[PDB]
Design a protein around this ligand. Structure first.
Ligand code: HEM
Length: 153
């Protein structure tokens, strides 16, 4: 469980992300695709993008970035009590999108990197630690749903 003070740190920085959801969403998906190219191959709708400049230019990619961060924000603000938000997400990602749990670890890494770049003063070691915990809690819960369904892997 995170403590109340750890959840404060997480939601303090997130309220800054929400100042520019679209620009954060871009940076994170682009970081993921460059760091782990195999993840881009899961997206039929972005597979054609070949360079970072092409990624940056895509309005559809920027739109999806907002989709992703908006779902994550709704989860984070539930401070652990995120059963109803997380279930639909685990089901589509396991059964329709076919996303390994490992790739959720990759995009967690991408989120922490971007937060670090954009918000040093609100993202010191204590905040990074809390955010890491929050994202581990997100993964652990997702992984349990995957296991139930037969997808752990
Ligand atoms: C922070 C973790 C993530 C969140 C919050 C998340 C959230 C979402 C949301 C809310 C949607 C649209 C509705 C749905 O189909 O569920 C979506 C679609 C999708 N996600 Fe994720 N996602 C996450 C991680 C990933 C990762 C790591 C991958 C792949 C490497 C992935 C692949 C997809 C694909 C393929 C779609 C369908 C895109 C399209 O064709 O419209 N997701 N995701």
């Amino acid at each position: 469980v995170l403590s109340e003070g750890e959840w404060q740190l997480v939601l303090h920085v997130w309220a800054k992300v929400e100042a520019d959801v679209a620009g954060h969403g871009q940076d994170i998906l682009i970081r993921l695709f460059k760091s782990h190219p195999e993840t881009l191959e899961k997206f039929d709708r972005f597979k054609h993008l070949k360079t970072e400049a092409e990624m940056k230019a895509s309005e559809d990619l920027k739109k999806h970035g907002v989709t992703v961060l908006t779902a994550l924000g709704a989860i984070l603000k539930k401070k652990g009590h995120h059963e109803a938000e997380l279930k639909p997400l685990a089901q589509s990602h396991a059964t329709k999108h076919k996303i390994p749990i490992k790739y959720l670890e990759f995009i967690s890494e991408a989120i922490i990197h971007v937060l670090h770049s954009r918000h040093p003063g609100d993202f010191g070691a204590d905040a990074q630690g809390a955010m890491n915990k929050a994202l581990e809690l997100f993964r652990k819960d997702i992984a349990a749903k995957y296991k139930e369904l037969g997808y752990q892997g």
